[PDB]
Design a protein around this ligand. Structure first.
Ligand SMILES: [Co+2]
Ligand SMILES: [Co+2]
Ligand SMILES: [Mg+2]
Ligand SMILES: [Mg+2]
Ligand SMILES: [Mg+2]
Ligand SMILES: [Mg+2]
Lengths: 206, 207
């Protein structure tokens, strides 16, 4: 309870959850959601941020979903592979929201906020997936996000995930990139580093 | 040329332009754009960031636009008021793009990136107006932004514009808030401060 409360209090009630999504295109309303990974965070007693929990689902292209081959070629996902283990968008988000809503309960926490690289992209797909599924209990703030591309611009002078991670002194494997799980991992680590670094430099507290 | 490359160099080529819009609702696709202000930035010889150029346009509701009274009640704008001096969305954007493209011409810069509080909101309306007007040659990055709500969250632990500005040491006047000019202005000063504060604590340069 404490470490989830100290986390939220760091962001005025916001409970930051790192999200990465794979898709069949750039249109959140018409292109398929194909993969989603979520990483929750926590604050240790010293006030340092770090990764807590990890969820990950492959998602079945919804009925009516367009699919751009350039997208599939990019992330390498085959929506047809049987051993894929894809579930519905509903199932994926419901399970993630369930884990998040619990976080928000143990609260100085009020609402969840999405952390993502170029968060506008991942946010819109999540909101669209939730839309199709008619999920009423959505714990994420409907418009606000923590975009690590902007935070990296500030702290690192880099907006590209790989280059930002490298520049931050992080390991980065191009061969593992563009996978929901790896990308979310790197992004959560990058996010935690930027915040902590700000702390180490005496930028925080105020 | 110097101040623009330095600036751009700080963000790997990105030429940051602060933007604030006023609208007739929350749907960028279907609700009216009513107002837009833009503030360019510059870096002095000491490496500090500050506001440079400012332009501002009231915008006439495009044909077919919806207007939410709650939106109008919120911002105080009357789209019928004859002395607004409202221009087309094409005109406001064209004028703003012209000034921005002039900045990108600097050797260091190669693309503009929008700075805004909850930037996804402003960015979507900007991109939709540009789309309505069939504007090629849009100098702003098509999907990237610098969101001051996120940067204030990190730097100050505040995400709300007024709260962040107050918490930052800046004056904020709720009287003048929710207007394009004022909001863009507070937002630009807040962005510059967060960047500068970062520099002053030794987070930048990386050396
Ligand atoms: Co779906
Ligand atoms: Co327009
Ligand atoms: Mg991504
Ligand atoms: Mg990815
Ligand atoms: Mg605004
Ligand atoms: Mg405003």
């Amino acid at each position: 309870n404490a470490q989830l409360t100290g986390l939220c209090d760091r962001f005025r009630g916001f409970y930051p959850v790192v999200i990465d999504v794979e898709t069949a295109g750039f249109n959140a309303k018409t292109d398929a959601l194909l993969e989603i990974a979520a990483i929750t965070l926590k604050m240790d007693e010293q006030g340092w941020l770090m990764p807590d929990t990890t969820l990950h689902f492959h998602v079945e292209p919804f009925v009516g979903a367009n699919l751009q081959p350039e997208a599939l070629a990019f992330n390498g996902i085959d929506p047809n592979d049987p051993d894929r283990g894809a579930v519905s968008g509903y199932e994926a988000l419901h399970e993630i929201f369930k884990v998040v809503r619990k976080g928000i309960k143990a609260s100085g926490c009020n609402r969840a906020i999405m952390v993502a690289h170029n968060a506008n992209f991942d946010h819109s797909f999540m909101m669209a997936a939730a839309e199709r599924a008619s999920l009423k209990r959505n714990p994420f703030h409907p418009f606000a996000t923590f975009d690590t591309a902007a935070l990296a611009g500030l702290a690192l002078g880099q907006t590209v995930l790989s280059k930002a991670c490298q520049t931050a002194g992080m390991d980065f494997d191009s061969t593992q990139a563009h996978s929901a799980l790896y990308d979310t991992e790197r992004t959560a680590v990058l996010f935690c580093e930027i915040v902590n670094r700000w702390k180490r430099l005496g930028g925080w507290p105020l």
